[PDB]
């Protein structure tokens, strides 16, 4: 038996809401150390890596490594039947072709029990080259979402320029161009309002806005986001999942 | 002649919003004891029965029993035009076949006078007698609304199974299957957000989920809903209309 | 050079919201006396005329009259990017391309520099010249908005009847008919409905409700609206924008 009881159900709701548009199907690599997902998106452009560590779960049980192939659109639909404050328990027999999802209200008067059909899929594998990056921008998650959205009216691509004297997002198109300059803070007082740049050398990279606008569906999961960049390698957009792990999205620059 | 004055016109806005999707035209039986509507949907699976007592109105007079044929699409349109806190007055002179509806804004600035056909058409008048039911379930209306909404993502039918210690709703379909068990809870005193059962013998019936989703548009009219059920007879779904009367939806099971 | 600055970002946004569904490509006349926009809408039915005097901006400089051809949907989008508390700067250097729109958030965290390509359109004009009208009605803007919206459920045309009593809007279609009567009560009254009317002779004209429902998108720009009517000429619906300027709509009555 695999069995994982997650007390804050909102978290799994949000993860599915952040993945279902970008990718339709993917295998859930389950083990004693946690749950891990790794997939390309459905247009073969970006890469996604999800991690939810075992200890994040209130109760956790994994007799042996499972791989469950999963339609995320169906999984999301089922999770929309969960409340935000439900305790969600995930359960699969060792080689069973189903995943049960139990949504307990907090007072135990209402209990829901769903049994999802798996789909049978060939796993993907990479993980990408772990790297020391030139720039690391930490910033509010709501601010990053709004920027990508604003600039998507102007252009299909965004140039992210970092230097010592700031970060800048620029886009360009048929109706013109725009530049959004977001200043580092010093003493912001809260921690989650900070804009901090860890800079080694200036960098200027171009990314497809369409894909960044997918990545920002993870905003509910965290109040900050970090962008790690270096020349000619994929951007990582990282959202922390409430002490349990993370959702990274990798994207090639143009060129 | 007919005239009924309702100071809390918000109630009548809620009833028409409850009726307009399911039923398109209906007979309005007006008498000195009040308003009684009764109709099948255009597909013959369900029946609605509405009752508004004369004493529920601020003023009421009926000279003359009347069977006004009414287009509920058109009446819901006109009611849209009413303020939330307008006084609503319904009116019919005699050998005129028109229903007038007068909305007087809260601080007598503005009177709106509306009038609609009153197409007296070949119709019905059933009733169907008092039955004794195997189960009667009372529960919060917003909770029944939620279970019908969520299960409609899974299948197009719901098995309702009643038992001493609770009621279950189960559905099955494309993306897998689902059951929601609500427990009898007692409490009472501080609120009736309870789930109570009255069980002479257990019941187990399948119903059309889309119809139950029409019925739940009445959710805003009452904090609770009752479900009376028996083998082979139509389910009743009752909503109380704040000390003026009731709204009952009737649905026959399958097989 | 042209340059204008405003603290009231919001007003600009509301002007574009109120124009952009009626007209696509527009020509802004920028002179030293201010900004002027005059155009038919894209169906050649109604006429719009916007005026924003130079004094209404808290800085204003214009060397040379410019005719800046803009797509109003694209400019509404851009202005959607700005904080409602943002300081806005409009800037152009004289012709081809660049209108620059700069949004500076209140305390210096964020600056947004946009640049809109201008197309070459001729500066229109015609400026149909003023008149004394049989009848001039002034009323709450949100009440005028609500009357057009509601009657649009009954009919496609409204008949405005002005009289010493007050003003009456009446519409008629398939479902039946409706009239709304606002009366002149005296003075010193709490209700915000002091409908006032300056009158030479009762008028009675019909108007397409589709277009009136375009003109009420200006509702946020002012709390009152003034209607000016005579037989055989266009209605004028005027929103005064706070001694900054005005937005006028012209619609001819049905024959």
Swiss-Prot record, chains A, B, C:
Changing residue 164 to R: Abolishes ubiquitination. No effect on interaction with SHPRH. There is a cross-link at residue 164 (Glycyl lysine isopeptide (Lys-Gly) (interchain with G-Cter in ubiquitin)). Phosphorylated. Phosphorylation at Tyr-211 by EGFR stabilizes chromatin-associated PCNA. Acetylated by CREBBP and p300/EP300; preferentially acetylated by CREBBP on Lys-80, Lys-13 and Lys-14 and on Lys-77 by p300/EP300 upon loading on chromatin in response to UV irradiation. Lysine acetylation disrupts association with chromatin, hence promoting PCNA ubiquitination and proteasomal degradation in response to UV damage in a CREBBP- and EP300-dependent manner. Acetylation disrupts interaction with NUDT15 and promotes degradation. GO terms for cellular component: centrosome; chromatin; chromosome, telomeric region; cyclin-dependent protein kinase holoenzyme complex; extracellular exosome; male germ cell nucleus; nuclear body; nuclear lamina. Changing residue 252 to G: Complete loss of interaction with UHRF2. Changing residue 128 to A: Complete loss of interaction with UHRF2. This is Proliferating cell nuclear antigen. It comes from Homo sapiens (Human).
């Amino acid at each position: 038996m695999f069995e994982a009881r997650l007390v804050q159900g909102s978290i799994l709701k949000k993860v599915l809401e952040a993945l279902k548009d970008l990718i339709n199907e993917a295998c859930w690599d389950i083990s004693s150390s946690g749950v891990n997902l790794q997939s390309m998106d459905s247009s073969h452009v970006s890469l996604v890596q999800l991690t939810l560590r075992s200890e994040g779960f209130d109760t956790y049980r994994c007799d042996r490594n499972l791989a469950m192939g999963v339609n995320l659109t169906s999984m999301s639909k089922i999770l929309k039947c969960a409340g935000n404050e439900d305790i969600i328990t995930l359960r699969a027999e060792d080689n069973a072709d189903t995943l049960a999802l139990v949504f307990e209200a907090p007072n135990q008067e209402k209990v829901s029990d769903y049994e999802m059909k798996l789909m049978d899929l060939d796993v993907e594998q990479l993980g990408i080259p772990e790297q020391e990056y030139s720039c690391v921008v930490k910033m509010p998650s709501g601010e990053f979402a709004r920027i990508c959205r604003d600039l998507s009216h102007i252009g299909d691509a965004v140039v992210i320029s970092c230097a010592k004297d700031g970060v800048k997002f620029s886009a360009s198109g048929e109706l013109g161009n725009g530049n959004i300059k977001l200043s580092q803070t010093s003493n912001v007082d809260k921690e989650e309002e900070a804009v901090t740049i860890e800079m080694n050398e200036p960098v200027q990279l171009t990314f497809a806005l369409r894909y960044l606008n997918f990545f920002t569906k993870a905003t509910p999961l965290s109040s900050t986001v970090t962008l790690s960049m270096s020349a000619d390698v994929p951007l990582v957009v990282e959202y922390k999942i409430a002490d349990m792990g993370h959702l990274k999205y990798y994207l090639a620059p143009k060129i």
